[model samples]
Target: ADLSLEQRVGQLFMVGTDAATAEQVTLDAITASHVGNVFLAGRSNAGVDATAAVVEQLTAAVTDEATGGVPLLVATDQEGGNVQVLRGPGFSDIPTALDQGALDPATLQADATTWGAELAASGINLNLAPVMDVVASPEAAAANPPIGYFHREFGYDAETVASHANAFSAGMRASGVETVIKHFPGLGRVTENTDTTAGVVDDVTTADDASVQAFAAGIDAGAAFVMTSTAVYSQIDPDAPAAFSREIVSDLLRGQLGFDGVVVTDDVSAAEQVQAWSPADRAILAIEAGTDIVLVSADPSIAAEMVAAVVAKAQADPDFAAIVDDAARRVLAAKGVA
Candidate 1:
C-alpha cells in the first residue's frame, strides 16, 4: 500500500536484455519505466565475472524512487545443453536434461548444485529451467518440437520426470539459487514450439493428467518459481491460452495445485504464439489471469508500455488495483522484499 501506483505496476514486469551487451533500451526501461526485474536473453559466453558486471549495471536502477527499492530478480534460461543461455569459462557445459536424467538422483542433484552455484556467482537469482515437461516417449519426443527437438525433457514419463526434476530443484536450492518448474499442466504432448509457432495447443492433457505431477513434485520440493506456457490446453481451457486463462492460472495452478509463489509467464514479450495480443494486453491478461510477473524478454523496450497499461488499468478499476496489489505483494515477497 505504501508503494505508488507506478512503482507497484513496475513490480509486475520482468524485462529482458542481451547477455553480452546490456542494451540502452533495457537500461532506460529500468531507470525510466521503473521495471523491477530482468531476464538475461540471448547467448553469452563471457562467464561469471563478465555476466555479473552486466547484472550489476542492471541492478543499479534500483533506488528508493525506482521500484520502491526492491532488487531485481535476474533470470536466464539455463536449462543446459542447447538451452543454456550463459556459457564459457566460469560455467560448466551442463549436459541436456536427457543426459542429466540418466545420472542417479544423488549425483545429478550434486552436479546441479554446482551449476546453481555458478549461476549464483554470476548474480543470477533465478533459473528458468529444469524443464519438467515429460514427453510421452522417445518416439514422441523426436516429433515434439519444443521439448524433444532440443532434448529438454527429463524423461518419457511423469514418474521419472518428477524424480529427476525434483532432484535438480533441490540442487539449485542448495546453492541459494531458485528454480522454475515450467510449462505448467505440461507441454510434453504438444508438437509445436510456442516461442516460434502460434496456436500451439495440447489436446491430450486433462486436469487429472499424470504429466502435471512433475510440476507438482517440484512445487512440493519448494521450487521458488513456476512458469506458465503460452500454449493452449484444449482439454483444460479451450478459449484462451494457459497464461491468459483464469481457469488454468488461478483455478488449476493456484486453486487446485495450491501454488503460493510467484507465477511467471513464458516469453510473452516476443513469442509468436502471443502476437495477436498487444504488449499491453499481454501484461494485463497474464496479471488478470493470476500471474505475478509478466515477462517481456524479447523486446525489453516494450516493458515501459506494459507498466503504463497496467497502471492505467489499476487507476481506472478498484478491483483491478486490488489484483495489482496482490500480484505486487507476491513478487515482493518472492524477492524477500516485505
Candidate 2:
C-alpha cells in the first residue's frame, strides 16, 4: 500500500487512553499527530456501553489525513483476573490464568471465545493477553514478581502454558478479536516486574528454552502479535533489553522462530525498566531492533514524541524509511487492511 511518511509513522505507535475518560493528549495524538492505534490503560469497571462511548470518542478522531484512512486498533489487557483491564456489567469477571489453566483446553477455548466477544462488542479489537511465559515451579512462581506474583502464568511448565495459551488465542480468533501472546521470550524466570523495577534480568532463558517454545506455540496457533519484554535476557543479549535487542527481536524471534506477525514492545513509555533512555530514544531503538509497534501505555504525550522521532529518522535515513514501511505493512496486515 502507498502510505505517506506520517501514515507509516502513525502505524508504528499505539498510545494510551484511560478507559473511564479519554485523555485530551491521547485525542490530540490521534487527531493531530496521526497516532494510528490506542490501548485502554489503567482500570475501568464501566461496563460495555459506557466503555464503548469512551472508545468512540477516540476512534472518531481517526481521519483520512490523520491516519491515512486506516481505523485504529483499540487494544486492552483483558488477560483475566488482576490483569483484566475492563470489568463491570457486560464484561466477565474472568479467572486468573492459573485458574483458567486448570480447565481442559477445549473448555477454556470456549470460555475465552465468550470473553473475546464481550471485548469485540465493547469496541476492543486487540487483546494483550494469554501470557505464554512459563514459571518453572510452584516454588519459583512465588518469587517471580511479574507473572507468578500476579497469577498470570497459565501453568508451571512450558508445555502446559503453551497448550492453554494456544487455546486462548484460538478462542480470540474465533471471536474476531486479535490476540497478542506476550512478554517473550519469557518473563517467568525474572525476579522483578519491569513495569515497577529497573534492571530486571532473565539470566537463564536461551533461544531453544522450553519457555521460549511456549511463545512459538502461540505464534503457530496464529497469534496476531508478539510483545517483547523490557527485561534483559542475559543469555540472549546481555547488554540490551529484549525490546531493544536486534539479536532477540529480529534474529531470534522473526528469524529463528519464523514468526511473521507484528512484534510489539511491552510499554516503553513509562516502564521503570526502560527509563534510562529518553522516550524518543526508546521508540527509535525498538524500531531499529525490528519491533513493529512501540507501546506507550503510560503516557499519550510520549507516544506523540515517539511518532515524531520515527518520522524524523525515516526522513533522514532512506534505509530506515524502508524499515518503517515494512512495519507499517505488518501492522496493516494484522488489522486486515489492504
Candidate 3:
C-alpha cells in the first residue's frame, strides 16, 4: 500500500471528543494515529463565537500534528429538535424532521438550507442528519424498535420520506457541510434500538431493491456519506450485522445503489444492538465489509485498541492491508481530497 503510518492509522478510526472542549487523550489519539474525524457532543450555549472558537482550536491542533496538514472531519448530530448539539446563543433551535415534513417541499428545502449554512458557519463540516426512516403507522411504531421510529422519520410512506430527505440533503450540501443519510438499509422497521441490545435483527423486508430507494434519492441529492445500521438484516446476510455485512455494504449499498461515496458505520463502540463482538473484532469486521469510516462514539481506550488492532492486522496480512488502503482511498475521495 505504501501509505505513511499516519494515513494508515487515520483510515482506521474516528473518535468522539469531550464536548466543545478538548482533552489530552483525544489529542493523543489524533496525534498518535492521525485519526481523521471527530464527533462532537454536548450543548452549546456560548453562541456562535464560542462554538467557532472551539472548532478552530480542535482543527488547529489536528492539522498542526497531522501528516500533510490533513484537518480532521469535525461532525455532529445537528438533525434539529431533540437530536441537535449546537444550540442556544448563536444557533437556532430549528424544528425536527417531522416538523419539516409537515411543511411544503419548498419550505423544507429553504429551512434545511439555512440550517446547513448555520452549521458550516460555525466551522462544522459534517452533519449526521436527514433521517430517511418511514414510520408508517402506530402499529409500525409498536412493531419497530425505539431508535428508528421515535420522531425521527419524515413520514409514514416512502415517497414522503424520500422527498423530505432529498430536500434536507440539498440544504446541507448547499451550505457546504456534507450530509449523511443514516441508519441504512432503513431502520423504520426495527423495534429495538441497536444502542442497547445485541443481535437485534430486522425481520421485515431488507432486500437490495426494496429498502434502497430512499437512500438512492439521498445519494442522487448529493449525500456525501451513508451511515450503515447496526441492526442485522437476516434476509440479506444472516451471519453479520449490516455494519459488518458484505451483502449489505458491498452487494447492496455499493453494488446495487451505486453509492461510490463514503460508507460509514454507526457508532460501533456503544451500540449493542448488533453482534456482540469486541471493539477490535468489530473494527476488523467493518473494514472487511467495506466501511470507509469506523465510528467509535465513546470509550477512547477501545478506540485506541481498535486502531492498533487494524494496524497490526494490516501489517501481518497483505489482504487486510489492501482493504484498509481501499477504505482510505474511498474516504479521501468522498471528502474530495484525493
Candidate 4:
C-alpha cells in the first residue's frame, strides 16, 4: 500500500466538478492521477439524492484496495447567505455568519451541529464554512463581494469573531463534519474579490491584526483545515499572495499562529490574482509555499495539468519533493481516513 511519488504529490491538488455527477474523466483522475480532494464546483441544487450519488462515485474512485491513497476531502461552499453553493431538498436553511454570530452561542452551536450532521449524512466530509473574517465597516461590507456584502463575517471584533467561529467549528466537528476556517491572514480588510478582480492587496494587515487573531483561534479549537487568502498582504509579504508566500503561509500561520493542520489555498483555478500564472504553476507554487491543498474551482480541464506539474516538480527537485511529502502526509493525517 505504499504510495508512489506521483500519488503523494497529486494529493496536493484538489479538483472540482461542474456537473451534478462526477464524470468518467474525473474518476480516472482519482485512480490514475491520485487526486484526493474534490469540491462541488457547479450549482448543487440537485437535491440530496443526486448530490449523494456524485459524492459516492467520487469517493469510490479514490478507494484503492491494493494501493494507498487518502480519502477525498469532498467539500462545498455551504457558508450560507450569498455563499450557499449547495441547496434544495434535504439541505436545511443555514443563516449568514453574521446572523449566526448574533444568536446565543449555545443556540448557534446546536443549529450548526444539526447543519453539519446533515452535510455529513449527505456524503460530504467537509463544510467550508464559519468564515472567521472580522468585517470592520459597513461600507466595506457592501463593497466586499466575497465576505462582507454576503454577510459572511461573524463580527467586526476579533474576540467575538473568534468565539463564534470556534463554536461553529466545534459543533460541526462534533457532528462528524470537518470544518475549514477560511481566507487566512484575513480577507475582510481587502476590497476586491480575488476571484474576479486582480491585484487585491492588503497593506495594513499585520500578523498581530485582529482578524488574523480570530483565525488563529479557530486553529486552536480543533479546526481541521485553514484556507489561504489569494490577496496580497503587503505588510507581511508584498510580492507573493499569501497562498504563494512562505512568509505568510508558513512563517505567519505556522510559525506565529502555530497552525499545523491542513493548509488549503483559496480557489486558484479561477482567481484573477493567480491567473497570470498557469494552472500548473499555481499548483506548484501553492504547495511550495506551504499549502497542503491547491483548490481549483475553475476549469476542470486543467486538473490533469495541475497534477502533472506538481508531480513533475516534486520528482525533479529534492526540497520541493520533500514539501509534497509533508503536505500529502498532513492532508491524510487530517482526513484520518480508514
What RMSD does model 1 have?
1.1
lDDT of 3: 0.76
Q: Any idea what lDDT model 4 has? A: 0.82
lDDT of 4 by residue, 64-84 (tens): 531265678888878777677
Residue by residue across 1-338, what tens digits does model 3's lDDT show?
Answer: 33475566675577787556765666667777777788777666666667777777667766545634666787888887768888867587888777878888888888888888788888888988888766656456656655335577777777788898888888788888888898788887776778787768877746643346778777776677899987877777777788889888988888888888888888887776633688889999999999989988666557877888888888898998888888888776666664
Candidate 4 wrong stretches, greater than 4 Å:
65-69
- Shift in Å, residue 191, candidate 4: 1.4
Where is model 2 more than 4 Å wrong at Cα?
Answer: none
lDDT sort, best first: 2, 1, 4, 3
Please state the error at residue 36 of candidate 3 in Å.
1.1
Worst 10 residues of 1 by lDDT: 1-10
Pairs that collide in candidate 4 are: none
Q: Write the per-residue lDDT of candidate 1 for residues 1-338, one digit (tens) a residue.
A: 36788888888888899998778888888778888889999989999999999999999878878877889989999999889999998999999999999999899999999999999999899999889888888887888888888899989877889889888888988998888899887888888889889988889988877777778877877877899989899899999989999999999899988899999998887899999999899999999999999999988867888889999999999998999999999989898877
- Candidate 1 lands at a TM-score of 0.98
TM-score of 4: 0.95
Alpha-carbon local distance difference test for all models: 0.88, 0.90, 0.76, 0.82
Estimate the TM-score of every prediction: 0.98, 0.98, 0.93, 0.95
In candidate 4, residue 83 scores what lDDT?
Answer: 75
Write the residue-wise lDDT of candidate 2 on 50-126 in tens digits. 89998999888987888977999999999999898899999999999999999999999999999999999999999
Question: Which has the higher lDDT value, candidate number 1 or candidate number 3?
Answer: 1
